[PDB]
Amino acid sequence: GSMSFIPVAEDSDFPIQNLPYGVFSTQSNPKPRIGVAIGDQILDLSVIKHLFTGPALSKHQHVFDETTLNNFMGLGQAAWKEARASLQNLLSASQARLRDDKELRQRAFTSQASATMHLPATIGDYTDFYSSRQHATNVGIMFRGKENALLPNWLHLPVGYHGRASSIVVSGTPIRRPMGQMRPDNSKPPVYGACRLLDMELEMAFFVGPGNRFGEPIPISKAHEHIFGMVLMNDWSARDIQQWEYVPLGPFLGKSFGTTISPWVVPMDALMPFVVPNPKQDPKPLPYLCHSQPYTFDINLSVSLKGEGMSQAATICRSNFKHMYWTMLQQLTHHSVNGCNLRPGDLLASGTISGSDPESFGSMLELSWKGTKAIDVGQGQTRTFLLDGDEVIITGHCQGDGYRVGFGQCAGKVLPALS
């Protein structure tokens, strides 16, 4: 292992092997600013930005003074690697520079318990993919039947859609049950009212680093240069609103009332120790989507649900990011193949993550099988879809020897509709 001078519990999400980036403020100082999580502390990068003296960062220390991570994300991998090496040195148990500087160390650290986290970046565009084969198969079985499950394009390209950026909110933001239009009765006109089928969707998402120029694709051999790091995501959805609206132009108001992300962006370099070979694709993708670089990650994901009267949250999903059929390299490559310009801070989400076991299905649409099965949420309590007052928390971790790379929380509680 590796150790910091900051005390780190063995099961901490935030050992020296992680070092995720986030935006926080405190009761002492309301300015949103950039920090790195270590143990139960935050290292304020605006305070220590003069210690980044290397070639990539010496002229660009102002990126650590910003209220968002966009400019640091836009600097690209030489800057990311330099920052990470600098932070691994400065936080090391055996390095005196920061460790023994009592006054600097005093103003550079703050407790995570005292901090308010904010969205880590200003997200210009958010895209949601559909890349978990079991998830898409489950939706197809439910909607179309066993024989017609996957549509003809699914095995040939990473299907995805443009999402709503404005309603991406940081963990802990309450989510109001949406009103909208639904058609519960096919023999009657649609109605207006509160959603009746409110759902969570277990996803992960990555932030884009340097963009590409308008009109210039990113070749798949270079896609890994544009992926900064990852967060957990809950794509909340209103299944009745979605079902009525989505043919033919896609999910819209069924998704755009709220999408939650966790605040700590785990850099790809922290996740590389947990990379595994990519799943075999058959049919083989077209050459522009073909890559040998391993880019599938062993990340254990868990979803809990706690009703408003419960004292214990129930774990309703245990899944893993390694199941996904299309990689992040393929998603990024496909997103830019037409010349579309990805920009720093854009967010590309995986799709709902389901494995083959029903215990690993990533939505309550799947876990309840379209409301036909009860989900056990603890002694004599069941769900099909979300109730008012329910809190959903997504967590994730990679497990090393004596350490984990964890993601903190992606939480939200459902508020009653305005009706």
The footprint of Ni ion (CB under 5 A) covers: 1
Give exposure, 135-163, as e/b (b: 16+ Cβ within 10 Å). Answer: bbbbbbbeeeeeeebeeeebbebbbbeeb
| Segment lying near Ca ion (by CB under 5 A), choices 121-129, 134-142, 276-284, 337-345 | 121-129
284 is in an annotated binding site: no
Contacts of 387 (CB under 8 A, 6+ apart): 307, 308, 414
352 is in an annotated binding site: yes
- At 205, which amino acid appears? A
Closer residue to its own copies, CB minimum distance, 39 or 180? 180
318 is in an annotated binding site: no
Q: What are phi and psi of 208, to 5 degrees?
A: -80, 140
Residues 411 and 413: their CA atoms lie apart, in Å, by: 7
Using alpha carbons only, how large is the chain's radius of gyration in Å?
22
Asked if 269 is part of the footprint of Ca ion (rule: CB under 5 A), the reply reads no
Residues 74 and 385: their CA atoms lie apart, in Å, by: 39
Closer residue to ligand HBU, CB minimum distance, 142 or 337? 142
To the nearest whole angstrom, how small is the minimum distance from the Cβ of residue 57 to Ca ion?
Answer: 36
- At 394, which amino acid appears? I
242 is in an annotated binding site: yes
Closer residue to Mg ion, CB minimum distance, 224 or 255? 255
Q: Which of the choices ligand HBU, its own copies, Ca ion, none does residue 141 contact, using the CB cut-off of 5 to 8 A by kind?
A: none
Closer residue to its own copies, CB minimum distance, 250 or 279? 250
- Which residue, among 126, 107, 125, 123, has the nearest Cα to 35 in the 3D structure? 107
Fill in the DSSP letter of residue 262: -
306 is in an annotated binding site: no
246 is in an annotated binding site: yes
* Choice among 135, 323, 334, 335 that is catalytic: 135
Q: Report the residue from 236, 244, 326, 385 that binds Mg ion according to the rule CB under 5 A.
A: 236
| Residue matched to tokens 């499950």 | 149
| Segment lying near ligand HBU (by CB under 6 A), choices 53-61, 114-122, 128-136, 391-399 | 128-136
To the nearest whole angstrom, how small is the minimum distance from the Cβ of residue 200 to its own copies?
Answer: 16
130 is in an annotated binding site: yes
For Mg ion, what does the binding mask look like between residues 247 and 286, x meaning CB under 5 A?
A: --------x---x---------------------------
Q: What is the DSSP string of 380-399?
A: T-EESSPPTT-EEEEEEEEE
| Segment lying near Ca ion (by CB under 5 A), choices 198-206, 209-217, 266-274, 400-408 | 198-206
Give exposure, 377-398, as e/b (b: 16+ Cβ within 10 Å). Answer: bbeeeebbbbeeebbbbbbbbb
- If you count DSSP H runs as helices and E runs as strands, how many of each does the chain have, helices first? 9, 27
- Which residue, among 121, 112, 126, has the nearest Cα to 406 in the 3D structure? 112
> Which token pair is 290?
């073909």
Residues 362 and 356: their CA atoms lie apart, in Å, by: 11
Q: Which of the choices Mg ion, ligand HBU, its own copies, none does residue 214 contact, using the CB cut-off of 5 to 8 A by kind?
A: its own copies
Residues 351-390 that bind ligand HBU (CB under 6 A): 351-352
| Strand-pair partners of 315 | 304
Closer residue to Mg ion, CB minimum distance, 6 or 353? 353
Chain positions contacting its own copies, by CB under 8 A: 124-125, 130, 151-153, 156-157, 159-167, 169, 173-176, 178-181, 183, 189-192, 214-217, 238, 241, 244-253, 256-258, 283, 286-288, 334-335, 337-343, 346, 415, 418
User: Is 135 a catalytic site residue?
Assistant: yes
Contacts of 180 (CB under 8 A, 6+ apart): 192, 195, 238, 241, 253, 254
Binding positions for Mg(2+):
235, 255, 259
Name the site residues for Mg ion (rule: CB under 5 A): 235-236, 255, 259
Binding positions:
128, 130, 144, 201, 203, 235, 242, 246, 255, 259, 352
Name the site residues for ligand HBU (rule: CB under 6 A): 128, 130, 135, 139, 201, 235, 237, 249, 251, 351-352
Binding positions for substrate:
130, 144, 242, 246, 352
Catalytic center residues? 135
